[PDB]
Design an enzyme around this catalytic site. Structure first.
Site, PDB file in Angstrom:
ATOM      1  N   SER A 227      -5.873   1.977  -1.839  1.00 25.63           N
ATOM      2  CA  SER A 227      -5.117   2.139  -0.597  1.00 25.63           C
ATOM      3  C   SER A 227      -4.071   3.245  -0.695  1.00 25.63           C
TER       4      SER A 227
ATOM      5  N   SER B 178       6.047  -3.119  11.912  1.00 26.56           N
ATOM      6  CA  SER B 178       5.931  -4.013  10.764  1.00 26.56           C
ATOM      7  C   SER B 178       7.081  -3.816   9.790  1.00 26.56           C
TER       8      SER B 178
ATOM      9  N   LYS C  11       4.760  -8.048  14.383  1.00 30.45           N
ATOM     10  CA  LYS C  11       3.797  -7.738  13.337  1.00 30.45           C
ATOM     11  C   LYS C  11       2.413  -8.252  13.752  1.00 30.45           C
TER      12      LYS C  11
ATOM     13  N   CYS D 205      -5.619  -2.280  13.284  1.00 31.37           N
ATOM     14  CA  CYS D 205      -7.015  -2.278  12.874  1.00 31.37           C
ATOM     15  C   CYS D 205      -7.890  -1.688  13.966  1.00 31.37           C
TER      16      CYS D 205
ATOM     17  N   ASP E 228       0.471  -4.976  14.694  1.00 27.46           N
ATOM     18  CA  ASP E 228      -0.116  -4.501  13.453  1.00 27.46           C
ATOM     19  C   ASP E 228      -1.574  -4.921  13.312  1.00 27.46           C
ATOM     20  N   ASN E 229      -1.786  -6.225  13.141  1.00 35.25           N
ATOM     21  CA  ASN E 229      -3.116  -6.761  12.865  1.00 35.25           C
ATOM     22  C   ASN E 229      -4.101  -6.381  13.954  1.00 35.25           C
TER      23      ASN E 229
ATOM     24  N   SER F  64       1.322  -0.525  -5.714  1.00 33.32           N
ATOM     25  CA  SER F  64       0.341  -0.750  -4.664  1.00 33.32           C
ATOM     26  C   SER F  64      -0.194  -2.176  -4.744  1.00 33.32           C
TER      27      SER F  64
ATOM     28  N   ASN G  36       4.769 -11.548   8.609  1.00 33.84           N
ATOM     29  CA  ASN G  36       3.511 -11.436   9.340  1.00 33.84           C
ATOM     30  C   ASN G  36       3.613 -12.095  10.703  1.00 33.84           C
TER      31      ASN G  36
ATOM     32  N   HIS H  27       0.832  -1.207   0.000  1.00 36.36           N
ATOM     33  CA  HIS H  27       0.000   0.000   0.000  1.00 36.36           C
ATOM     34  C   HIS H  27       0.869   1.260   0.000  1.00 36.36           C
TER      35      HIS H  27
ATOM     36  N   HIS I 180      -7.890  -8.837   3.647  1.00 32.25           N
ATOM     37  CA  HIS I 180      -6.957  -8.332   2.629  1.00 32.25           C
ATOM     38  C   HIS I 180      -7.549  -8.180   1.218  1.00 32.25           C
TER      39      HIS I 180
ATOM     40  N   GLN J  51      10.298  -5.773   8.227  1.00 30.49           N
ATOM     41  CA  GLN J  51      10.491  -5.922   6.782  1.00 30.49           C
ATOM     42  C   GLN J  51      11.931  -5.672   6.354  1.00 30.49           C
TER      43      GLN J  51
ATOM     44  N   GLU K  20       4.211  -9.532   3.986  1.00 32.53           N
ATOM     45  CA  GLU K  20       3.695  -8.719   5.087  1.00 32.53           C
ATOM     46  C   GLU K  20       2.480  -9.337   5.780  1.00 32.53           C
TER      47      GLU K  20
ATOM     48  N   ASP L 153       2.803  -8.181  -0.242  1.00 33.98           N
ATOM     49  CA  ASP L 153       1.790  -8.519   0.741  1.00 33.98           C
ATOM     50  C   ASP L 153       0.503  -8.953   0.047  1.00 33.98           C
TER      51      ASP L 153
ATOM     52  N   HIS M 169      -3.227   2.150   8.828  1.00 34.00           N
ATOM     53  CA  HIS M 169      -2.665   2.105  10.171  1.00 34.00           C
ATOM     54  C   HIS M 169      -1.779   3.323  10.442  1.00 34.00           C
TER      55      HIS M 169
HETATM   56  N1  LIG Z   1      -6.909  -4.246   6.591  1.00 35.85           N
HETATM   57  C1  LIG Z   1      -5.653  -4.346   7.157  1.00 35.85           C
HETATM   58  O1  LIG Z   1      -4.935  -3.368   7.279  1.00 35.85           O
HETATM   59  C2  LIG Z   1      -5.189  -5.690   7.618  1.00 35.85           C
HETATM   60  C3  LIG Z   1      -4.193  -5.851   8.582  1.00 35.85           C
HETATM   61  C4  LIG Z   1      -3.802  -7.127   8.967  1.00 35.85           C
HETATM   62  C5  LIG Z   1      -4.408  -8.249   8.378  1.00 35.85           C
HETATM   63  N2  LIG Z   1      -5.384  -8.059   7.419  1.00 35.85           N
HETATM   64  C6  LIG Z   1      -6.129  -9.213   6.720  1.00 35.85           C
HETATM   65  O2  LIG Z   1      -7.166  -9.568   7.595  1.00 35.85           O
HETATM   66  C7  LIG Z   1      -7.455 -10.982   7.386  1.00 35.85           C
HETATM   67  C8  LIG Z   1      -7.255 -11.734   8.698  1.00 35.85           C
HETATM   68  O3  LIG Z   1      -6.151 -11.238   9.341  1.00 35.85           O
HETATM   69  P1  LIG Z   1      -5.950 -12.179  10.847  1.00 35.85           P
HETATM   70  O4  LIG Z   1      -4.495 -11.943  11.046  1.00 35.85           O
HETATM   71  O5  LIG Z   1      -7.104 -11.622  11.633  1.00 35.85           O
HETATM   72  O6  LIG Z   1      -5.966 -13.713  10.410  1.00 35.85           O
HETATM   73  P2  LIG Z   1      -6.431 -14.738  11.573  1.00 35.85           P
HETATM   74  O7  LIG Z   1      -6.359 -16.017  10.799  1.00 35.85           O
HETATM   75  O8  LIG Z   1      -5.926 -14.423  12.945  1.00 35.85           O
HETATM   76  O9  LIG Z   1      -8.154 -14.488  11.833  1.00 35.85           O
HETATM   77  C9  LIG Z   1      -8.938 -15.035  10.837  1.00 35.85           C
HETATM   78  C10 LIG Z   1     -10.157 -15.556  11.558  1.00 35.85           C
HETATM   79  O10 LIG Z   1     -11.233 -15.743  10.637  1.00 35.85           O
HETATM   80  C11 LIG Z   1     -11.987 -16.824  11.147  1.00 35.85           C
HETATM   81  N3  LIG Z   1     -12.806 -17.292  10.041  1.00 35.85           N
HETATM   82  C12 LIG Z   1     -12.436 -17.861   8.814  1.00 35.85           C
HETATM   83  N4  LIG Z   1     -13.488 -18.157   8.046  1.00 35.85           N
HETATM   84  C13 LIG Z   1     -14.602 -17.760   8.803  1.00 35.85           C
HETATM   85  C14 LIG Z   1     -15.993 -17.810   8.553  1.00 35.85           C
HETATM   86  N5  LIG Z   1     -16.454 -18.320   7.372  1.00 35.85           N
HETATM   87  N6  LIG Z   1     -16.878 -17.345   9.497  1.00 35.85           N
HETATM   88  C15 LIG Z   1     -16.340 -16.850  10.647  1.00 35.85           C
HETATM   89  N7  LIG Z   1     -15.061 -16.748  11.017  1.00 35.85           N
HETATM   90  C16 LIG Z   1     -14.203 -17.220  10.053  1.00 35.85           C
HETATM   91  C17 LIG Z   1     -10.914 -17.877  11.557  1.00 35.85           C
HETATM   92  O11 LIG Z   1     -11.472 -18.684  12.541  1.00 35.85           O
HETATM   93  C18 LIG Z   1      -9.774 -16.948  12.113  1.00 35.85           C
HETATM   94  O12 LIG Z   1      -9.795 -16.809  13.507  1.00 35.85           O
HETATM   95  C19 LIG Z   1      -6.408 -11.506   6.370  1.00 35.85           C
HETATM   96  O13 LIG Z   1      -7.023 -11.413   5.130  1.00 35.85           O
HETATM   97  C20 LIG Z   1      -5.260 -10.494   6.541  1.00 35.85           C
HETATM   98  O14 LIG Z   1      -4.507 -10.298   5.400  1.00 35.85           O
HETATM   99  C21 LIG Z   1      -5.789  -6.809   7.040  1.00 35.85           C
HETATM  100  N1  LIG Z   2      -0.733   2.553   6.546  1.00 36.20           N
HETATM  101  C1  LIG Z   2      -0.312   1.359   6.027  1.00 36.20           C
HETATM  102  N2  LIG Z   2       0.714   1.337   5.113  1.00 36.20           N
HETATM  103  C2  LIG Z   2       1.087   0.108   4.631  1.00 36.20           C
HETATM  104  N3  LIG Z   2       0.603  -1.126   4.914  1.00 36.20           N
HETATM  105  C3  LIG Z   2      -0.409  -1.058   5.826  1.00 36.20           C
HETATM  106  C4  LIG Z   2      -0.922   0.127   6.424  1.00 36.20           C
HETATM  107  N4  LIG Z   2      -1.958  -0.169   7.317  1.00 36.20           N
HETATM  108  C5  LIG Z   2      -2.084  -1.505   7.273  1.00 36.20           C
HETATM  109  N5  LIG Z   2      -1.163  -2.102   6.375  1.00 36.20           N
HETATM  110  C6  LIG Z   2      -0.946  -3.509   6.029  1.00 36.20           C
HETATM  111  O1  LIG Z   2      -1.902  -3.901   5.081  1.00 36.20           O
HETATM  112  C7  LIG Z   2      -1.959  -5.345   5.072  1.00 36.20           C
HETATM  113  C8  LIG Z   2      -3.357  -5.785   4.723  1.00 36.20           C
HETATM  114  O2  LIG Z   2      -3.437  -6.202   3.364  1.00 36.20           O
HETATM  115  C9  LIG Z   2      -1.459  -5.795   6.457  1.00 36.20           C
HETATM  116  O3  LIG Z   2      -0.265  -6.555   6.307  1.00 36.20           O
HETATM  117  C10 LIG Z   2      -1.141  -4.480   7.188  1.00 36.20           C
HETATM  118  O4  LIG Z   2       0.012  -4.541   8.004  1.00 36.20           O
END
Ligand SMILES: NC(=O)c1ccc[n+]([C@@H]2O[C@H](COP(=O)([O-])OP(=O)(O)OC[C@H]3O[C@@H](n4cnc5c(N)ncnc54)[C@H](O)[C@@H]3O)[C@@H](O)[C@H]2O)c1
Ligand SMILES: Nc1ncnc2c1ncn2[C@@H]1O[C@H](CO)[C@@H](O)[C@H]1O
Ligand SMILES: NC(=O)c1ccc[n+]([C@@H]2O[C@H](COP(=O)([O-])OP(=O)(O)OC[C@H]3O[C@@H](n4cnc5c(N)ncnc54)[C@H](O)[C@@H]3O)[C@@H](O)[C@H]2O)c1
Ligand SMILES: NC(=O)c1ccc[n+]([C@@H]2O[C@H](COP(=O)([O-])OP(=O)(O)OC[C@H]3O[C@@H](n4cnc5c(N)ncnc54)[C@H](O)[C@@H]3O)[C@@H](O)[C@H]2O)c1
Ligand SMILES: NC(=O)c1ccc[n+]([C@@H]2O[C@H](COP(=O)([O-])OP(=O)(O)OC[C@H]3O[C@@H](n4cnc5c(N)ncnc54)[C@H](O)[C@@H]3O)[C@@H](O)[C@H]2O)c1
Ligand SMILES: Nc1ncnc2c1ncn2[C@@H]1O[C@H](CO)[C@@H](O)[C@H]1O
Ligand SMILES: Nc1ncnc2c1ncn2[C@@H]1O[C@H](CO)[C@@H](O)[C@H]1O
Ligand SMILES: Nc1ncnc2c1ncn2[C@@H]1O[C@H](CO)[C@@H](O)[C@H]1O
Lengths: 427, 427, 430, 430
Positions: free
Chosen positions: B78, B356, B181, B190, B185-186, B73, B176, B50, B296, B360, B151, B126, B348
């Site tokens: 993003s 994170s 991380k 979030c 991060d996660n 990206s 990750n 991103h 993701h 990296q 990532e 990532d 974030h």
């Molecule tokens: N938006 C962001 O900035 C950001 C940051 C970190 C991770 N992510 C993404 O978020 C997603 C999960 O990250 P995580 O680290 O929380 O993974 P994680 O595996 O800890 O949590 C995933 C959860 O989803 C649950 N799950 C799966 N299928 C399901 C269903 N059908 N119904 C209900 N629950 C279900 C699993 O039991 C698991 O606990 C991934 O796609 C990851 O890439 C996004």
């Molecule tokens: N501000 C940011 N810049 C770059 N990557 C980010 C940011 N916020 C969340 N992410 C990353 O985006 C990924 C989700 O696809 C995760 O790995 C998370 O660490």
């Protein structure tokens, strides 16, 4: 045949058990499913765990599965007399009571080693006192012992040290490090029993107080969260930068004991480590600072220093001592530095112990039923079994778990039945 | 040479970076310590993350260490234009902007593959889009690539699937699953950016609402905690009994989407899984239910169904669509189902991204400086380095970390310098 | 003739004194009162009959009143609330106290009657908690009313009764509503219950709170604290309420708000805090999950229909004192705590000593106020001045190492306010 | 002659309307008002001059007032608070509005003056937020006062001013304190700020909250919410306070309470909520950590000494609108949000629409009350009846699917209370 404080408490004990069973769905399924099978047939399980209401249900479960059990306590003030009485009433040799001396403590563990039909072939220990006793004093019985399971964090750390130095001669299953134990017991257990322990001993108000928690592992986290919930300002100490950062990210001031000793109203040690609170700390403490420990052994608080340097020691009631120091201020010590939740309260509630003990049974089974998979080493319970323990408790909480569709399971590349996480996952 | 929305934003971009640096002590130490050494000399790091203010600081750090970088990206909405502009202004080929089409998205990643002095020899991906592109479309460059670092959770799950089927031809480091991380991060990331995303898009009140969070992993936990903090009643769904029990033990009702769809005011998907919210759910939702995703990829919400079955789609503003359904009620969809924290907010904060990204860099170094230790496989960063990342952030937070004494370190059987935990520890 | 006192076991006096010594260190509000007034003895000539839980905290209050020169005779305001070692400590100090844990309804009435007459005249001051002492005199001893200078009432149910008596023209003695001092209502009721509710449940049952569904009826100050405490330990809390404002508060805080008729099918734990009758009834009991825990923390045992459990259950087993386990025709069980009496004092030690120092400092001030400045208080129900209300809070800041900011003269003039307070208008709700 | 309105960009009207449509769904309190009164038009003949933040939420309020038959002319009560698309939507609807984001102090005064005169006479009703419209008329247009039937005031600083005017005998129009309606003070100020403070900080700086030390000055309703929100995101919150009661509350909730002189050395984020002058001064700025974020959410920009930053800093860089980064002689930097003006509306969109529906339903009721029942309100500062206060809360329970309990006739008689309320005494603090 047994040894307890009062057998006349067995009636009350039985009631407290009947109540416990409804709160322990985990262990009840085991009885439901294995009663007729009697997998533990032939196993003489020598036990060294806190003889409590919760443990009683565990002891009876092992029997329901067809084993012979002899039980001792792992702490000299953790035993619950009425729970020890109900077990003793069921024809099960139990040697434990509340308020044992060190000589009495060692003498208890010794009675559980030999059964009617031979020595012990199974250990169910926590802290490793029974483990270390048989390895040092009775190495002639080690070959007869098939397997061992360790409940607590300090006991498994010891089981890893023994294996490294090649002195661990019997295979062992790390039950602490089952997710269902470490992440629930240590955390949610202490979260609820810490303040209970402190309250019964002192009835002090938590709100408005500064509370100092040494350590921020699973136990520290629970303790911190609890104290926070009641409106205490919590200060954390830590040696691990990862744990320390976790605490900072939750809004906790993280500093040293050398600093915190000056502002804490309440002190809780959770490190599993020696020399946490010392004379130089005590001397700086606010008046009537309450000091207690909830790590497994009583080595974190320098109690010896208080006994040697205080001007006067006043006993308030059992497990509650109030020292006056040469500076005129006073220190309130709980349980003489032994773990406060079992010393001044009833320990963890049955529901969480159901989790820990449903693990313990699976570990006792797996060591006795499938000895092949487990050679002399420190092993883990498979995730699927770890998941089964948690799953077994969902019903009582009216949790409705989702089931993956075929299409979803394929997309994720995992089975509908589990396991749902890779081994390195930390939850 | 590059491609962005507006180079005239570079000035504003540079300011936002200067501010970011103070919030990213982790990455600053790396520049402090490696600037003169230039460990990354010779490395042409193709990047697919991103393109944000936070990422800009990461890109510049890799350069400060003497590398050539080309950035794309990983999500089509993003990118932060002013951040992409400052980087483009520094003489670094960046191909990314806010509001890309799929064809544009693929076209961006393609520009980052070839440098002036040869193809790419490093991947920093990532989700694994860049990883899968080079493996499928350009397998002739795989041998030239020395290492890769992933990532996010979905991207490493993919890296494990590839290795299993023997199609992963390049060594990789799971960034990750560094504690620093996954656990920060996660979770904490979030926790702060979710509501920000929702707020900017809708300005809806969280208090008093029922919020439905699908999934209770690290992301779900953060989302749940955040929504809870603002006075929402949070309902969790889960497939994993361990995660589900964790949620129950925190006071969350845990049920199915089939039930929850009927009472949720706000819907947040965090599963990383397909088919989470479907037409049969939408039809049952309360009026103006706000639906968004923070997994993701945009595969968790059935957006296609809304486009095909709604009576009308009204765009409120970018990344905010309001569908009227045949039942007369309306669904508010954010970011067309793409992850909402980067789509409707700024993602974030820099501080957590410092963690994170400090990971990296260590992973990019370890792959380029010590290629020996890492053969074709999915590997972890050692705990000591994981600890170093956390330690590097303690200063800014004024955390005072305790140091073990000799006597304590001996008693624990660990080093004063660390590591302080066994590999299976879950924090 | 007349017993000097009556308590469970005078032998518990030594232990009680220790608990008193410890408590004193946690009750700066009362200890400041002693220091300030021990020489002047403002309560000289006062004969205070106190009807209020005979705990360690109340003991500290009693000895404070005596230190101020008062004569004091005491009984408990609940049959299960007395702490015997604290009673012994007072009895041993030569103060007439009539209270022990586990009184009969008849013994309770007897205990109050022994506090009414002193060696040198009838009582001339009332310190009450629930109005039981207040009602007894107005009903059975009306000829004592002209000899009583004032009444201070501790709790919500009690002050509600006072206001009703005034509206109906039957209250004959001036009274100070102590419950609605900010430093009482917003602290005692809220923070005290937040800690003592869980205490009573735990000692009685040792049940896991985490993962349970807990139903809290009412969302006033007591309900707010109760709810907060339960959710803090990982329970999912459901709220019932009749007041739309209180209900909106609950919702805004992330609680499910619904009716008992709905919630009785879900709850694993039930806690009533309404001060109202008929909260949990037979029709609710019959729908509860197995081993549902049921308790009340409102002032009177009227919220739970215990008599229904006693007449309609097929089994009744006493687990231990103040813990009974019923079984219904459906074969499911109900655990009842303290026979429906308030569970924090019934199954535990009530509020911690620190927050009680707030309440009791208000009580002492009220007593001084009524005793030394009667003409300020015509027959009616009055509040303490906010200045004194603020002083109570101030007296407790030191122990917590709070550092209070002082207004500059410019700031005070800008706010149109005195540097020494009061800092809020009368209608402020904090 | 007279401009029909003045706004930033009439083109934003279509967008604003969408935001209005969405907002309406979140403001049941106001939508019930429309449904109930659109036919009867109680506010017919009213000419309401409104001085209050021109946001989306206020737009819904404006159109509600018109639906009730009123004539309305509007300006913002802060120079940074207007939401231009919402202004456009109103302007397009043919309502005279004078407001845009980023007004000069002089333009702000001009905007208020345009609301004073309508096509068919002067204003005869006031809806104010801070008293700026109220003071302007009393000072510069006193000949308009006899033609004004009433004043409703939104916020704490404003009602404080009203009370001072009354005490000094200079208030000439009857007024309703709307701020201190329970459904305003305990919800808007508390829950609104708990969500909008973080909003303003985030949009302005995108800073990590977790791990930071945040200093909140003042611990009233606004401070309570602010503090709660910050700690919720993992910040360690430190509190300053002059009121010992509020300070004890903070301590009891687990907050460190101390002075700004101490806390300025620790804070990474500073938030003033006192409504008082001189909270953060040069001597504080000089001790702050690098890139300390400083903002105010009290009604007026008087709490932070911005002029000091402007005269004593060696560098000043505008990061983006309402975000300036100073550097001091010590070489450390200070980030200031919204030039010291209230940051939730300055750098974000203010309170969410749901809680504003509480406040604004109170405003509408007050307007009806003053307009249709003047004789109830002599010159003074009055509260709404609790019955109406309760009705506001009740109107919002439906949207949240709250199920309110109804008293049985027996329960009501036991509590000495009406089934339809009011359910609390006047002095109740919730
Ligand atoms: N938006 C962001 O900035 C950001 C940051 C970190 C991770 N992510 C993404 O978020 C997603 C999960 O990250 P995580 O680290 O929380 O993974 P994680 O595996 O800890 O949590 C995933 C959860 O989803 C649950 N799950 C799966 N299928 C399901 C269903 N059908 N119904 C209900 N629950 C279900 C699993 O039991 C698991 O606990 C991934 O796609 C990851 O890439 C996004
Ligand atoms: N501000 C940011 N810049 C770059 N990557 C980010 C940011 N916020 C969340 N992410 C990353 O985006 C990924 C989700 O696809 C995760 O790995 C998370 O660490
Ligand atoms: N009382 C109970 O019922 C109960 C329940 C579970 C575990 N335990 C005991 O609690 C102790 C820890 O349990 P855990 O699971 O929390 O282990 P853990 O390893 O997760 O936490 C231990 C923490 O102590 C910290 N630490 C070590 N030395 C320190 C020092 N000198 N100063 C500050 N911090 C220091 C480490 O960084 C680590 O995070 C063990 O002794 C375990 O047996 C007791
Ligand atoms: N046990 C203790 O230590 C302790 C401490 C303080 C107060 N109290 C007692 O607790 C009770 C409540 O104290 P409070 O100050 O919280 O009173 P309060 O009036 O603030 O709140 C009581 C709540 O009950 C609600 N209510 C009334 N009838 C109801 C019904 N049928 N269903 C649901 N909700 C209903 C009211 O609306 C009100 O919000 C009083 O009896 C008081 O004396 C006990
Ligand atoms: N921005 C918004 O959306 C919004 C919303 C509601 C209220 N407000 C404004 O916020 C301000 C506060 O509102 P409140 O209702 O919280 O008022 P309040 O009076 O409840 O609390 C204000 C607190 O500031 C404390 N205080 C006064 N001077 C102080 C000092 N020098 N140092 C420390 N503390 C001090 C007072 O003791 C009081 O507790 C008012 O100006 C009000 O108009 C703004
Ligand atoms: N009530 C209890 N009964 C038995 N073991 C317990 C109880 N509460 C806590 N423990 C265990 O005590 C150990 C600490 O030495 C931990 O393993 C913990 O699980
Ligand atoms: N520990 C205690 N000692 C005496 N009274 C108490 C205690 N805890 C709570 N109370 C009082 O009990 C009353 C409820 O009847 C409340 O008004 C409260 O002040
Ligand atoms: N979104 C909003 N629209 C209008 N007024 C608001 C908004 N958010 C907060 N306020 C008001 O701002 C005032 C502070 O001056 C408070 O009284 C509050 O009612």
């Amino acid at each position: 045949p047994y040894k307890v404080a009062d057998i006349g408490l067995a009636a009350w004990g039985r009631k407290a058990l009947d109540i416990a069973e409804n709160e322990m769905p985990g262990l009840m399924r085991m009885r439901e499913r294995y009663s007729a099978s009697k997998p533990l047939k032939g196993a003489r399980i020598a036990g060294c765990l806190h003889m409590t209401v919760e443990t009683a249900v565990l002891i009876e479960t092992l029997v329901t599965l067809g084993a012979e059990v002899q039980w001792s306590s792992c702490n000299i003030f953790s035993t619950q007399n009425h729970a020890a009485a109900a077990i003793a009433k069921a024809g099960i040799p139990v040697y434990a009571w509340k308020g044992e001396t060190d000589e009495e403590y060692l003498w208890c563990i010794e009675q559980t080693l030999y059964f009617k039909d031979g020595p012990l072939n199974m250990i169910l220990d926590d802290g490793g006192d029974l483990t270390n006793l048989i390895h040092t004093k009775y190495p002639q019985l080690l070959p007869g012992i098939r397997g061992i399971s360790e409940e607590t964090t300090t006991g498994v750390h010891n089981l890893y040290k023994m294996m490294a130095n090649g002195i661990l001669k019997v295979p062992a299953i790390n039950v602490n490090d089952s997710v269902t134990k470490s992440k629930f017991d240590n955390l949610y257990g202490c979260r609820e029993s810490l303040i209970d322990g402190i309250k019964r001993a002192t009835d002090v108000m938590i709100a408005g107080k500064v509370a100092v928690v040494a350590g921020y592992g699973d136990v520290g986290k629970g303790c911190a969260q609890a104290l926070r919930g009641f409106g205490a300002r919590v200060i954390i100490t830590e040696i691990d930068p990862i744990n320390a950062l976790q605490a900072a990210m939750e809004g906790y001031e993280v500093t040293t004991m050398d600093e915190a000793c000056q502002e804490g109203n309440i002190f809780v040690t959770t490190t599993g480590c020696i020399d946490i609170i010392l004379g130089r700390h005590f001397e700086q403490m606010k008046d009537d600072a309450i000091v207690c420990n909830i790590g497994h052994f009583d080595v974190e608080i320098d109690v010896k220093w208080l006994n040697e340097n205080a001007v006067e020691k006043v006993n308030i009631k059992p497990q509650v001592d109030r020292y006056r120091l040469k500076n005129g201020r006073r220190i309130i010590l709980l349980a003489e530095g032994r773990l406060v939740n079992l010393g001044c309260a009833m320990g963890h509630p049955s529901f969480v112990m159901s989790n820990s003990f449903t693990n313990q049974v699976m570990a006792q089974i797996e060591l006795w039923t499938h000895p092949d998979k487990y050679p002399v080493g420190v092993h883990f319970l498979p995730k699927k079994l770890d998941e089964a323990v948690a799953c077994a408790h969902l019903g009582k909480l009216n949790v409705k778990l989702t089931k993956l569709t075929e299409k979803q399971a394929q997309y994720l590349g995992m089975s509908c039945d589990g396991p749902f996480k890779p081994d390195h996952y930390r939850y």
